Amino acid sequence: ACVHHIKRRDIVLKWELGEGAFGKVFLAECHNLLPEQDKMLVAVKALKESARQDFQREAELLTMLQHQHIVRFFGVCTEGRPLLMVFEYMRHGDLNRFLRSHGPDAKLGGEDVAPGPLGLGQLLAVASQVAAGMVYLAGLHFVHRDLATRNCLVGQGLVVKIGDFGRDIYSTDYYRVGGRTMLPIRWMPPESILYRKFTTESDVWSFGVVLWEIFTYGKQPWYQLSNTEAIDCITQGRELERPRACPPEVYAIMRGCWQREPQQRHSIKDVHARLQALAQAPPVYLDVLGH
Ligand SMILES: Cc1ncc(NC(=O)Nc2ccccn2)c(-c2ccccc2)n1
Incomplete structure (x- = not known):
């Protein structure tokens, strides 16, 4: 100890x-x-x-x-x-509330963030930070099991860090089973829902869902569906749509986190390199990415 x-x-x-x-x-x-x-x-x-x-x-x-x-x-x-x-x-609280309060659905102060919804470069800096944390955990052979924006914190200078809390204003992010045991189904891969298997490979599916949350400004994945309706299309191979704010290059990163066969998914070291490149990319290259 x-x-x-x-x-x-x-x-x-x-x-x-x-x-x-x-x-x-x-x-x-x-x-x-x-x-x-x-x-x-x-x-x-x-x-x-x-x-x-x-x-x-x-x-x-x-x-x-x-x-x-x-x-x-x-x-x-x-x-x-x-x-x-x-x-x-962490001054800004959890990543979910931060995304929602700096989104197009927000009503209004600018020390770390510019006026209006977060820009593409900001959203990507946020995604690369969460990926870097996942690279470390996968490196240590640690499986998170509850990777979601509500489990990340934002500090001074838009520093994003991973944690694991218990939430409770996020009760609809969980599916209650045995009157006590809860599952973040919307964030889980088919092998976890069907076979109850949780590995490093399943965390990248969850990170992929996190990538979609960032770009939807913290909206719930499969929000339009109930928990059973969500389990059906996750287990039936149905993928989350491309968020309005998401360029195709980034959607190509998400899609690659969602390859049904766990072994056929990209490593987290990969996803991070692809996101770091886009975060550290000059405005000229990024302006071309935004349409
Ligand atoms: C408004 C607000 N500001 C900051 C927060 N937390 C932190 O700065 N650190 C921290 C560290 C470990 C576990 C929980 N929180 C939280 C918050 C409170 C409860 C659970 C989740 C986040 N909320």
Whole structure:
């Protein structure tokens, strides 16, 4: 257990940010966490609570996964109750709400983003960041299982990072099975729905769905269908349409994440190289991509 610890006197709760079942998230002030910083803002998760052993293995797993496009984990506070998990605070909240509030369906302030809906270059910078995080996880042979824009965070400078939360204003993004167990069906490949198989290969299908969410400005995949109607066409080989804001070159990336045969799909190292090239592309080349 190389899990970093924090003393409860070093954490000062300000107010709530989010809530769930196995938690509730607070914005807090943390002292002596990072040198030269003195005091910094963090997101503190107070746990529900015998799942202390479940919490410990989860803490050990979050310590292991530390990268530039993975939501930073600082440590736990085991001294007293409730048990606390400390993470980095992300000014813009989750990627889904960020997309919806910077979309054509938004009513209105410009420090990190220009007026109006996010541009093609911004949307691609957002997609390449999520891909870079998936390259690291696939590299470590880690299978996410819940890759969606509602599980990504956006920080100062439009830095996008991957996490895994519990949500609850995103209940329609899940299909309730055994009165407790939930599935993000709309984000799952046929092998996961039909055979209950989840691998690195299935994560690229999910990233492909994330790519479609980015370009639809956070709209739900298969929104026009119910959960069973969604399972039918996912298992029957039906693909999501090209988003209005999506150029054909990018739709070619999504389609390649959606090759039914898992082994016939492009690697995440590939998808990332194709997205990084488009994000780092000059405006002249990108203006040609936009029609
Ligand atoms: C309004 C708003 N700002 C920031 C947020 N979170 C973070 O800055 N970090 C973080 C880290 C780990 C787990 C959850 N959140 C959240 C939020 C709250 C609950 C769950 C999802 C996101 N919401």
